[PDB]
C-alpha cells in the first residue's frame, strides 16, 4: 500500500463532498514529490500532504492511520525517508489558514499520549477526539471535519 494509494484514499471523501477539485489527489501527489511533508514525531512519523489552495473550494482535513509504516520523504532535508503511520491531508484555501492548521497539527503530534491513542483507537473514536480538539481552536472554525474523513489503511 503505497504513497499514492494513501493520498487517493484520503482525498476520496473530500472529492465526494466536492470540497476540492476532482483531480485533487493527483495534484497532492505531484506536490508531495516536489515539496515533501514527512515529519518525525517522537515515536512515529507523520505526513501532512497537501497542494495549492487554488484547488480547494472549502476547507477540510482528512486523517489516516497506517497499520504499518510507509516511507515519505522529509519535510526537512534528510538522506533517509520518514516512516509514517499518521497522515493529515489538508484541503486549505488560504496561506493564513494553512499556517494556523499546521501550528495546530504540530501541537497534536507533540502530544505523545494523544498520538499514542491515535494508533489504537477506532475510526469513530478518532473522529470524536479530533473533533473535540478542533472545536476548541476558534481559528479552526472554518475547517470541515466529518466522520467519513477518518480511516485506517492497509
Amino acid at each position, epitope marked *: 500500500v503505497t504513497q499514492e494509494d494513501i493520498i487517493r484514499a484520503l482525498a476520496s471523501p473530500l472529492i465526494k463532498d466536492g470540497m476540492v477539485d476532482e483531480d485533487f489527489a493527483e495534484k497532492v501527489i505531484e506536490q508531495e514529490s516536489r515539496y515533501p511533508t514527512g515529519l518525525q514525531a517522537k515515536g512515529v512519523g507523520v505526513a501532512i500532504p497537501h497542494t495549492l489552495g487554488d484547488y480547494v473550494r472549502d476547507n477540510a482535513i482528512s486523517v489516516g492511520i497506517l497499520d504499518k509504516p510507509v516511507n515519505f520523504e522529509g*519535510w526537512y532535508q534528510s538522506p533517509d525517508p520518514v516512516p509514517v503511520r499518521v497522515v493529515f491531508m489538508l484541503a486549505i484555501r488560504t*496561506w493564513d489558514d494553512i499556517v*494556523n492548521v499546521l*501550528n495546530w497539527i*504540530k501541537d497534536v503530534i507533540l502530544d505523545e499520549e494523544f498520538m499514542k491513542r491515535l494508533l489504537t483507537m477506532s475510526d469513530e473514536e478518532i473522529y470524536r477526539q479530533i473533533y473535540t480538539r478542533i472545536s476548541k481552536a476558534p481559528q479552526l472554525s472554518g475547517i470541515h471535519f466529518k466522520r467519513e474523513y477518518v480511516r485506517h489503511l492497509g
Partner: antibody
Amino acid sequence: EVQLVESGGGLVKPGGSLRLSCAASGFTFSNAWMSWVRQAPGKGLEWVGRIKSKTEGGTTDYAAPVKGRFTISRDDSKNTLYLQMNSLKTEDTAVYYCARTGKYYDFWSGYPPGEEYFQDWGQGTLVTVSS
Amino acid sequence: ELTQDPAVSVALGQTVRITCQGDSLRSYYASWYQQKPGQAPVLLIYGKNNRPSGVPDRFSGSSSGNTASLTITGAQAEDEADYYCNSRDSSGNHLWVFGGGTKLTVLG
C-alpha cells in the same frame, strides 16, 4: 528574469494625489503577494503596504501614517500593481519600490502566519511632495 | 521597534555580526537586505537561514532571544553596504517593521 518597473513618480503639491504603477514580468504575478516599500532621501527603508494574492484573499495591510490616504490594488490581467496616493504630505517624499513578496513559515518553530520577505525589488520611482 | 547599530567595521577577510533587536524577534524570523548607494535593496537572508540563489555562502542568519543576526564571514570590499533587518510587528504602526540600518565599512 524577474522584472519590476515602477512608474508615475513626480513632483506634486501637498494635498495632491498621485498614482504609481509597477509592471511585473518573469514570474506568475497572480500567485504573488506584492508590497510597496519607500525610502526618503538619505533615510531608511519603510514598508508602505502589501496586497495578498487573490487566492490568499486579496486583502491589504497598510502602514499607520498612510492608512486612509493610500490604497493598493492590482490588475492581474495586466500584471500590474498600483499605489493610489491621496492627501499627500511632504513627509511622503521618497523613492517608492514595488517588491515581490514571498512568504515563509517554519513547521517546528514558526508562529502563524509566519514571515513575509521582499525577494525582488524594482528600481524605484521618485515621489517629491513640495509646495 | 527594531533596533540596529548605525555603523560597524570589519577588517578585510574577517567575520562581522550585524544584530537587530526587538520584541517581535522572540516569535518571528528576520529577513535581511543589503543596499549599496544608488541601487535597490537586495534580499540576503530570509526565514531561519535561507539564502536566495546568487547570494554567497559567506552570509548567514541566526537568532537568539529578542535578537537576530546577519553574519558575514571573510568580509570583502564589495560587502560594504547598508544592512537592514525586517520582521513582524503585528501590533505597531508598521506590520512589517525595518530596523534603522547598519552601514558596514571594511577596513584594511
